[PDB]
Structure formats: C-alpha cells, structure tokens
C-alpha cells in the first residue's frame, strides 16, 4: 500500500525558518517528480514546488510567490522529500501536502502558522444544563487548531464542534454531544481537547 | 502553468439526484506516453484531499459505484448519479500531464432535504471560568434545514448584543442539517448584576421564536 | 496503480 506521511511544520515568527518532511512508503517514488501544494484556510489547493527524478537532473521549480525564499530537495535513497522554508511570511500559513506528479496518493498535510503572536493555550469550561446535550467551551488559544473529542473517540455520533471564531487575536470554539439521558445517568462524560501549539491536552468531566 | 477551469462553484440537490462538474483545460491533458493525468479529488471539512477518480475514469479503490469521470482532451466531467448524504465536501479536479500540478477552483457540493426545526438548549457558565473572572453563555441551536436561522439573547428582557460570538457548522454528513453555537462573553461583574438569560431563534420552520432561558 | 510509479511520470 502506497503512503506519504509529513512531519515538522508548527507555528512560526515572520522572517523564521521551518523545514518540513515527507516519507514515502509502499513503492518507490524514484521515478516520479514529486511536489509541494499548499492550501491557505478556506481556500483552494496550489502547487509551492516541484522537483524532477535523477534523469532530468534533479531539477527544481517554484512557484513565483515561494522563489529564492523556499527549497525542495529529495533523498531517494531514504524515500525522502524535504521542503526548507526561509524567510516566511505570514501569507505562507497554510496546509502543506506532498504528493507525486501522478497526484494519487497524498499525506495527511502539515500545518505551517506564520505569526509575531505567541502561543496561548485554551481554557476548557464543561456545558452542563429523552436526549441530553452536554458540551465543552474552549475559549481563548492561538493559533488554530485544536482537536475535540468526546470520552477519546468512543462517543462519535450526535458530536457538534463548531468551527472557531477569532476575536482580539485570540480563537474560541465550542463543541457539543447528543447522549441518550441514561448514558449521562451512569458513564462518565468527559471531552478532551489537544492545542498542538501549546503542547496541551486537556480533559473536562462534565458534571451534573 | 496549465488552467483548469473548474464549474459551477456550487451544486445543490437532494438525496438520489444526479450532479455533474466541468473541469476544462487550457491545455490537452493527452501525454506523449498516452495516459491522461486528469484526476478528482474530494476534500471533506478539516480532511485532506482524497482520490476518487484517477486517470480520468479510473475508479480509485473504496470509491461507490456511483462515482463516475469522463472527458479526453481539453474537457472533463465527474458525475455523481445518484446523490447520497455523505457525497458532499469540496471536489477539485487535478492535472500532472504538464508540469507543474494545477488545479480546477473547487465545487462545494451541498444537500437539500426537508426543513427541520432546531433543537435549543442554553448554557450557564461553569463555575471554574467565574472563578477567573470572566462569564459565557452559550446556545446550542442543533439539527436545522434550511441553514438561514436568527439568534438573539435577551437580559432580563433587553437584547444584548455585544459579546455574542456565533458559528455555524458545515453541513452533516449523516443527516444533511446545521447547527449553531452562540456565545455571550461578559464580566462577572455584569453577569452577577442581572438575573434572566434568554436565548431567542427563529427559523423558518416556525412563525414562533424558541425560546430558552435560565435564571441566575 | 503502483504500475504508475513503476513507468514513472516526471514532465
């Protein structure tokens, strides 16, 4: 089974450097170009930059917007691809996603955050009042994202997060579960919350 | 760099439709080699892209049945026949004939189904965050069709409407309603000095706002 | 479809 994976990325100052990475599995990619696509939130896909196989010299290409500030390069031998981003401004802050010319398989994308803002990490706050809703406030965290489950994954179904608003630079989301009453009469209910950016995880048991 | 010009922008239909996207080129997406590297991509919210047709009408694997991709040249079309709930997200085309990759702009594609009413439910705050300070009221507005819906909180019976955040979901993937969340923020000071929180929505299923309140 | 990284694709 073919597969790319990322890693690096993270939040970033204007003018900072961040090298990313993508490992390929499954099959060798020493035959294909391979290429950096980015996506800025809420927009669409766009190619950043493109390196040529051993063939064609291992040629490299940019996108005007990335050109003298980004560089691709490849490792064959390891089934590495590398993007090393100087200089980055925050119109770079998006998604990056690796993938072959052939443009089948994709990774699963790094997020690069390009900010003077620091860090702040959320403060999670339990919604607490047939079906119950129960639910968490996460309120106050920069940058985007965070994830939320609810008891680790296991309740799923009836699961509202709310995309986050920004106010005074700093971003507040809610989410939500739907449970049959019972379930809160007997289980726990708790929603776990991670900010990758904070290097937090929270949980928060909702109480009656 | 090879233009895809992607339409329409949006498509909307009901469950057991038939939809089609356009994905054109610029340039014949023919290789010298004789494939076409034309593909299409769906991308759900928050997901990465994921192949569903690759080589113009190469089924990727997992992919329904009712996914289908046509075209040669110049002009291209993914058809879904016969629309079902989990089919919406974003949908691009994506070329690799020419160097560099492109994309087509995107097709949004959502669900019409039957109007259903809102389930509301209103939030105090928690005892931890007044304890730092600060106060928030929350309502929950959930499972609603048609997405156009108002909110509004009352104070003891003025409306307020500083501090209200408000954020409304993407579409369900199950059973192809919204929900909203609406957000209060204010000092403890402010929220101590008044007693009725309501949280007031209208929509179009009812004439009738509902009405959800708490008292302090 | 790993024939299509088997033949390669590179411009």
């Known amino acids: 089974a073919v597969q790319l994976v990322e890693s690096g990325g993270g939040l970033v100052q204007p003018k900072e450097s961040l090298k990313i990475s993508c490992?390929?599995?499954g099959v060798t990619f020493s035959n294909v170009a391979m290429y950096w696509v980015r996506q800025a939130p809420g927009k669409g896909l766009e190619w950043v930059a493109r390196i040529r196989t051993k063939p064609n010299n291992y040629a490299t290409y940019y996108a005007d917007s990335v050109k003298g500030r980004f560089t691709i390069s490849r490792d064959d031998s390891?089934?590495?691809?590398?993007?090393?981003?100087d200089?980055?401004?925050?119109?770079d802050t998006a998604m990056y996603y690796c993938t072959a010319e052939?443009?089948?398989?994709?990774?699963?994308?790094?997020?690069?955050?390009?900010?003077?803002?620091?860090?702040?990490?959320?403060?999670?706050?339990?919604?607490?009042?047939?079906?119950?809703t129960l639910g968490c406030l996460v309120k106050g965290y920069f940058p985007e994202p965070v994830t939320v489950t609810w008891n680790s994954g296991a309740l799923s179904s009836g699961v509202h997060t709310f995309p986050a608003?920004?106010?005074?630079?700093?971003?507040?989301?809610?989410?939500?579960?739907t449970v049959p009453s019972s379930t809160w009469s007997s289980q726990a209910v708790t929603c776990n919350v991670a900010h990758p950016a904070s290097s937090t995880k929270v949980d928060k048991k909702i109480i009656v | 760099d090879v233009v895809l010009t992607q339409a329409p922008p949006t498509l909307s239909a009901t469950i057991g439709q038939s939809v089609s996207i356009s994905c054109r080129s610029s340039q014949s997406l023919l290789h010298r080699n004789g494939n076409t590297?034309?593909?299409?991509?769906?991308?759900?919210?928050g997901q990465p892209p994921q192949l569903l047709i690759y080589l113009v009408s190469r089924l990727e694997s997992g992919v329904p049945n009712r996914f289908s991709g046509s075209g040669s040249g110049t002009a291209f079309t993914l058809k879904i026949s016969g629309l079902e709930a989990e089919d919406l997200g974003v949908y691009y085309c994506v070329q690799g004939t020419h160097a560099p990759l492109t994309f087509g702009s995107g097709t949004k594609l959502e669900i019409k189904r039957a109007d259903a009413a809102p389930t509301v439910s209103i939030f105090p705050p928690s005892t931890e965050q007044l304890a730092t300070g600060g106060a928030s009221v929350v309502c929950l507005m959930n499972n609603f069709y048609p997405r156009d819906?108002?909110?509004?909180?009352?104070?003891?019976?003025?409306?307020?409407?500083?501090?209200?955040?408000?954020?409304?979901?993407?579409?369900?993937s199950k059973d192809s309603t919204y929900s909203m969340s609406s957000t209060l923020s204010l000092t403890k000071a402010d929220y101590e000095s008044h007693n009725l929180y309501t949280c007031e929505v209208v929509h179009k299923t009812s004439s009738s706002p509902v009405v959800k309140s708490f008292n302090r | 479809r790993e024939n299509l990284y088997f033949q390669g694709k590179d411009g």
């Open chain 1, 102 to 132: 052939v443009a089948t398989d994709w990774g699963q994308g790094v997020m690069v955050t390009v900010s003077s803002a620091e860090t702040t990490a959320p403060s999670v706050y339990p919604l607490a009042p047939s079906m119950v």
């Open chain 2, 149 to 172: 819906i108002s909110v509004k909180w009352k104070i003891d019976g003025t409306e307020r409407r500083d501090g209200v955040l408000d954020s409304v979901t993407d579409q369900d």
């Open chain 1, 165 to 177: 608003v920004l106010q005074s630079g700093l971003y507040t989301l809610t989410s939500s579960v």
């Open chain 1, 87 to 91: 200089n980055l401004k925050t119109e």
């Open chain 2, 37 to 45: 590297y034309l593909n299409w991509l769906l991308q759900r919210p």
């Open chain 1, 23 to 25: 490992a390929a599995f």
């Open chain 1, 78 to 85: 390891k089934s590495m691809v590398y993007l090393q981003m």
